[PDB]
């Protein structure tokens, strides 16, 4: 894990591995849906899409043909606080991969013709998550939780917003955040020095950050959203307070989520699915941003057992919060996280995305031994304490069901 | 890649990798929804779930706790002609993993208490797959293509059959199919002889296959299934005849699908998405079985655009079936296949999975160079001649939308 910075401000984080042929290149940029403003909501993501619609040198099709000729291992995504462009290529093509990615980053032309057709694919992309109740219900939750703050706005944006995104709005946005302080090129695997030089000589071109983003801090609202949709199952999402990205007790939150509904042996999985068989899917995950964070639970059950399911999830989270977790459970988690982390080290795309994301959000890195210690250091006291603070709060609710009305069971909860 | 056939028929296929520290274990059984009969439909998939409900010495929860303490990378899946139980662990736990996987395979306790329970989870699983229009649409395509054949059966079964299920049906089925000729153990990664002999010793207990399974051949028919559901997009699938697993011209089909809609540079991705902006998701894939096989295309667009999508796809599938491939495309296809294959050599699950699947469905082991030759050996007209044979046929059609009525996909006017 060697970390270096150029004059323009962009950072180059790399990590050589020794039993791999491939290499994983990733262009991280510290901006996403959170950094947008009502009117440009969806710009961060729509931009990620235009980067593949053609440049002056190569067309959208030539771009597809290039990555395909090298495994097809390319992809890009947008989050609330960051965007990402990456690829996995056999070293002998890593230079070519960087050349194509550069052209896209810099000399990407946003023609009127392309920007038009691409607006539609996102309109389709939007309807597609819409037809997927177990997917969109998670977003409906982000909305309730953060009201009208940017943390509540959808990544894909709204349709009224996209309808106006022009090359002007794009470049304006892009020319603000796609600058030194937000850019971070991450490389992992069969990393050659020759490639690093090609990277430095290219991403030095990026302009320094002049703009100074000043953002508001979100506030948790125990709100609820309910959308009526002809479904078979009632999809429930319950959000609770979490912790910021680099908070003191992040690992305690990781371990807590693990005991909550983060794994096969979690309270939720064992109580809701394993013993009652109420859901096929029941799980939890933590979402952490640089100043806020939330713990989310998800469960799908038939329209009838929605009352029964609610009381049940209620008991579990209630009991966890009040009584905490056992040492056996705490030790079972550490083994899981440690073992999970170990097995991930084998993947290049795994190390690249970890380093890039850490640098971009935490700026700090830890060797494997440093990571394993942090996991060990956690005390049952810590976890059980946190469980009471977080799971004893009024949660937010997003629900999708046949009638579109809240369940009666959705009341008592202190 | 070593292979080994015990006296009961069980086969142990191994592949050692020093570069890694992990190891993927897989118990591949040669049965699936295809081998079931009207009344026992879904039995294969139920059995796969029931294998995690508890043994004489490990309960459902204890099974869960174990696999979680070793990373939690364990999963099971049922296909049409094989079922799979696999896990990934660190070298120093493989023994234990094998013991647990073994005990689950042999000593499971199909308790009515746990089985009545699991039946409910599977019922949720069915409804959940139902609330996923972009997924269930693929299942309907198999029903419209094969009618009453076992290939047209949904892997999860039906609520009726599942309700008939009991420990009796399970064991009666498990006895016939979970035997010598059908069991294959695949291990890849950092394997030590100790572990291999442990596997050898343990899986000797597998009873020799005595049941002679008689399988009928399927008939492909261009039938149509439509389902009226409240959605934003029209989910569509088209099926074309394919090739059966053994077929010599499989590499030809692989390349043909790649050109069709199996990549970014594929005809469908460029014609339907990049250029028309009709679909966010459009792709093709092939399903190869013992006696039959088939090429599949998926697409989803806003309702108001369904008729246009069918025409546009029609045009794409014609100029392909008629004119064929180009020399640039054929090689692009090869570069991709070789590239991805090379890149997959870093994942133990990837090798474990490949190995066990070919040994099971081809009774053959293909080395890298061997597979690579095949890819390269494919001549441009092999693909073209194939696309002409397969893509000309009247396709089977699956569809889910709002009005629930078929569009205008019966005539060739535009």
């Amino acid at each position: 894990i060697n970390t270096m910075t150029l004059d323009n401000g962009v950072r180059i984080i790399t990590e050589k591995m020794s039993t791999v042929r491939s290499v994983s290149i990733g262009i991280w940029v510290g901006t996403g849906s959170r950094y947008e403003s009502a009117e440009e909501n969806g710009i961060s993501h729509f931009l990620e899409h235009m980067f593949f619609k053609g440049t002056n040198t190569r067309s959208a099709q030539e771009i597809a043909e290039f990555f395909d000729s090298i495994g097809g291992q390319v992809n890009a995504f947008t989050s609330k606080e960051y965007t990402c462009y990456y690829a996995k290529v056999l070293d002998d093509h890593a230079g070519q991969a960087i050349d194509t990615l550069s052209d896209m980053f810099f000399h990407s032309t946003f023609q009127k013709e392309e920007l038009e057709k691409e607006r539609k694919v996102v309109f389709e992309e939007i309807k597609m998550v819409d037809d997927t109740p177990d997917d969109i219900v998670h977003d409906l939750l982000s909305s309730a939780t953060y009201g009208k703050h940017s943390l509540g706005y959808p990544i894909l944006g709204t349709v009224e917003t996209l309808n106006s995104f022009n090359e002007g709005m794009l470049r304006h946005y892009m020319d603000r955040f796609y600058t030194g302080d937000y850019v971070v090129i991450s490389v992992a695997g069969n990393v050659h020095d020759e490639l690093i030089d090609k990277i430095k000589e290219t991403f030095s071109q990026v302009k320094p950050t002049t703009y100074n983003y000043q953002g508001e801090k979100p506030m948790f609202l125990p709100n609820r959203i309910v959308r009526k949709k002809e479904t078979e199952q009632a999809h429930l999402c319950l959000g609770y307070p979490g912790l910021p990205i680099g908070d003191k007790d992040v690992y305690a939150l990781v371990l807590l989520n693990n005991v909550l509904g983060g794994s096969m042996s979690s309270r939720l999985f064992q109580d809701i699915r394993e013993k009652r068989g109420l859901c096929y899917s029941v799980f939890s995950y933590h979402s952490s941003f640089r100043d806020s964070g939330m713990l989310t639970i998800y469960a799908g059950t038939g329209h009838d057992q929605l009352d029964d399911l609610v009381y049940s999830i209620q008991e579990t989270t209630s009991a966890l919060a009040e009584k905490g977790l056992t040492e056996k459970e705490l030790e079972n988690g550490k083994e899981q996280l440690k073992g999970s982390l170990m097995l991930s080290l084998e993947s290049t795309n795994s190390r690249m995305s970890r380093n890039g994301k850490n640098e971009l959000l935490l700026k700090k890195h830890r060797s494997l031994d440093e990571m394993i210690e942090q996991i060990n250091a956690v005390q049952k006291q810590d976890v059980s304490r946190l469980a009471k603070i977080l799971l004893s709060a009024s949660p937010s609710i997003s629900l999708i069901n046949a009638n579109g009305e809240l369940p009666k069971a959705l009341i008592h909860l202190e | 890649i070593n292979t080994m056939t015990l006296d009961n028929g069980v086969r142990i296929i191994t592949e050692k990798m020093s570069t890694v520290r992990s190891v993927s274990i897989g118990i591949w059984v040669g049965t699936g929804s295809r081998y079931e009969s009207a009344e026992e439909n879904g039995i294969s998939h139920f059995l796969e779930h029931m294998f995690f409900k508890g043994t004489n010495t490990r309960s459902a929860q204890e099974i869960a706790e174990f696999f979680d303490s070793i990373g939690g990378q364990v999963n099971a899946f049922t296909s049409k002609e094989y079922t799979c139980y696999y896990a990934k662990v660190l070298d120093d736990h493989a023994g234990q993993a094998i013991d647990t996987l073994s005990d689950m395979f042999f000593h499971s306790t199909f308790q009515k208490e746990e089985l009545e329970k699991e039946r409910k989870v599977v019922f949720e699983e069915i409804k959940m797959v139902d609330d996923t229009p972009d997924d269930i649409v693929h299942d309907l395509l198999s029903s419209a293509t094969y009618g009453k054949h076992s290939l047209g059966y949904p892997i999860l079964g039906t609520v009726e059959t599942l309700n008939s299920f009991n420990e009796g049906m399970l064991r009666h089925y498990m006895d016939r199919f979970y035997t010598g000729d059908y069991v294959v153990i695949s291990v890849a990664g950092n394997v030590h002889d100790e572990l291999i002999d442990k596997i050898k010793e343990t899986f000797s207990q597998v009873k020799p296959t005595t049941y002679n399974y008689q399988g009928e051949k399927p008939m492909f028919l261009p039938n149509r299934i439509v389902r009226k559901k409240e959605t934003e997009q029209a989910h569509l699938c088209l099926g074309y005849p394919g090739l059966p697993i053994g077929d010599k011209d499989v590499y030809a089909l692989v390349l043909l699908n790649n050109v069709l809609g199996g990549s970014m540079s594929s005809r469908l991705f460029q014609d339907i998405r990049e250029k028309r902006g009709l679909c966010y998701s459009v792709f093709s894939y092939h399903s190869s079985f013992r006696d039959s096989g088939m090429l599949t295309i998926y697409a989803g667009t806003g309702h108001d655009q369904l008729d246009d999508l069918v025409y546009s796809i029609q045009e794409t599938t014609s100029a392909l079936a008629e004119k064929g491939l180009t020399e640039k495309e054929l090689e692009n296809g090869k570069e991709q296949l070789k590239g991805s294959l090379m890149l997959s050599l870093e994942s133990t699950n990837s090798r474990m999975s490949r190995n066990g699947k070919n040994e099971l469905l081809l009774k053959k082991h293909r080395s890298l160079d061997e597979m690579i030759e095949q890819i390269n050996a494919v001549q441009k007209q092999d693909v073209s001649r194939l696309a002409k044979i397969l893509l000309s046929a009247s396709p089977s059609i699956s569809l889910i939308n709002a009005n629930g009525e078929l569009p205008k996909a019966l005539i060739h006017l535009e």
């Binding site: 890009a76 969109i136 219900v137 | -």
Partner: peptide, 17 residues
Amino acid sequence: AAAAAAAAAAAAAAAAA
């Protein structure tokens, strides 16, 4: 497989993933 990305729990936002 191994090649890992960096998605969340549920909300598509990629090229075709």
